[PDB]
Structure 1
Amino acid sequence: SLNSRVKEILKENTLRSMQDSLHFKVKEVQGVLENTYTSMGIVKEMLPKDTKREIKIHLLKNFILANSHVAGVSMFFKNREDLRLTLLRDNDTIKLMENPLAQKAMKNKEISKSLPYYRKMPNGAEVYGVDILLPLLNENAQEVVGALMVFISIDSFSNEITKNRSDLFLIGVKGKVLLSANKSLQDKPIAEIYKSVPKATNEVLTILENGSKATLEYLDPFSHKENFLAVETFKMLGKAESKDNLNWMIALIIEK
């Protein structure tokens, strides 16, 4: 008898310890984004200052070199044709000459972000990432003079999500898998992938809209064994306010 009272107490503790482990991982991903956004704020303020084009390229280059999860940055200046540049990682950085999200951002004077997409890199590879768009202001902090685009590599979060583990999912807009040990799931919705357990995907998709966190059980269509699932949301753009600031999600699974 008391065996069975012990087994329900231990299951409670398994679920809560799983939730703590997920929370630790969420904070780790938020802290990567926050390191990047701190540097990005400083570049945003310094890029429109009264500096030669070459200073500005040094600034963008050192921003990317310092931020491992940034795969490229772009500046566009309204009234300067020599300040419309992209930098992308290759071995070090490659400079290349030459906009709805950016047009929006300059007009609302507000940080924007794109949906996840693949972008080609100097060595023919394709990096899955999101653009973050920021207005650049003149000295008086009122006139918009340009835009800064930061390409955040979602693949870079392999250091946090898939490194020596395969039990973690990074989930994004509308249930899309952004990153997971199984690269075949990238860019596909959990509603498609996990159609065999509709209560689960729909409980998960609720938590993703509502923010919040939760645990459940579901039958994994790949392993065919029963799995504990724990999910937890955070705001990808952090504090901000922008209409574009959505919940991302990290999911953690454990075989029952």
Structure 2
Amino acid sequence: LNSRVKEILKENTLRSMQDSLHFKVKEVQGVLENTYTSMGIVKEMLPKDTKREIKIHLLKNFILANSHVAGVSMFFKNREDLRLTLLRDNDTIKLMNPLAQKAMKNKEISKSLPYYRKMPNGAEVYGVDILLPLLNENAQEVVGALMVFISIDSFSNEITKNRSDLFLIGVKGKVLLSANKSLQDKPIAEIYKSVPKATNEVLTILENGSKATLEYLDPFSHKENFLAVETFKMLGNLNWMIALIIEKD
């Protein structure tokens, strides 16, 4: 049978891979729908006819209350006095946007591309911004806006601490985080040039927002791998995805 069973063994493995991965994905999700809420609080309170001294603490608290959050920032249309921008030194520091606007012009909220933000010590952090229009007591008029800078790098906790077999992949297939940092901000279609059968199945699932398994010769290991991949809407509409690889052995 050694092939009848090599094939049942395969099934056994991919099943538990997807089980594990599905847990890995649940993890990373609730770490952000917690924030989007622990956030959200913030949206309603801030635009209160309260004071700059008040709101700072409000924001300075919400950063502290969300590890993977690395900064925030505030605007108010003609009340220009109310600009400010708080970031990560190891406490917060105060330092010194057609999307922010755009989502005011909506009252729907939006995200950005991943990008690298230089930080008060000098260090550059990969992250996305999450915009959040600020609106009036009646909520038919647009006040200012908020901006929460989510460190993608902060998720090495979930992604790369003591394992190195997971990948976080965001839009059109750009590796967002991975044990090897050479890959951050490069798209899978070029990292894995060698296996378009594979990257086209991954880019497809990403688009459709689903899960699958498959195999590919890895170009770093030079050996065949099993791959399980699974998606989730990063705000709680477009997908991020996590990948879990296992060398056949």
Instruction: Tell me the CA shift for residue 226 of structure 1.
Output: 0.6
C-alpha deviation, 1:43, in angstroms: 0.1
**Count of aligned residue pairs for this structure pair:** 248
Q: Deviations over 1:30-89 (max 9, x none)?
A: 011111101111000001012111010000000000100111000001121211110001
| Distance of 1:139 and 1:95 partners within structure 2 | 28
Matching residue of 1:56: 55
Question: What is the distance in 2 between the residues matched to 1:109 and 1:53?
Answer: 23
TM-score with structure 1 length normalisation? Answer: 0.95
Counterpart secondary structure, 1:254: strand
Q: Aligned to 1:3, what secondary structure does the other structure show?
A: coil
Alpha-carbon distance between aligned partners in 2 of 1:104 and 1:39, rounded to the nearest angstrom: 24
Taking the aligned partners of 1:139 and 1:234, their CA distance within structure 2 comes to 33
Measured after TM superposition, the shift of residue 4 of structure 1 is 3.2
Where in structure 2 are the equivalents of 1:61-100 lying within 5 Å? 61-97=60-96, 99-100=97-98
What is the CA-CA distance between 1:9 and the residue it aligns to? 1.2
Aligned counterpart in structure 2 of residue 101 of structure 1, from 94, 99, 102: 99
| Deviation per residue, 1:201-252 (Å, 9 max, x gap) | 11111000011111111000001011001100000010xxxxxx21000000
Following superposition, the deviation at residue 3 of structure 1 comes to: 3.6
Contact 1:215/1:230 (CA < 8 Å) preserved in 2? yes
Segments of 5+ residues of structure 2 without an aligned counterpart are none
**CA shift at 1:96, angstroms?**
2.1
Offset, 1:8: 1.4
Contact 1:79/1:145 (CA < 8 Å) preserved in 2? Answer: no
Q: Distance in 2 between matches of 1:7 and 1:112?
A: 47
Post-superposition shift, 1:147?
0.3
| CA RMSD of superposed structures (Å) | 0.8
Distance of 2:57 and 2:51 partners within structure 1: 10
What is the SS of the residue equivalent to 1:113? coil
Which sits farther off after the overlay, 60-69 or 76-85?
76-85
Return the alpha-carbon distance in structure 2 between the equivalents of residues 181 and 152 of structure 1: 19
Distance between the aligned counterparts of 2:244 and 2:209, measured in 1? 16
Q: Give the SS at the match of 1:192.
A: helix
Deviation at residue 117 of structure 1 after TM alignment: 0.3
My pick for the range that moved more, 135-144 or 180-189, is: 135-144
What is the rounded CA distance, in whole Å, between the counterparts of 1:42 and 1:91 in structure 2? 24
Residue aligned with 1:253, SS:
strand
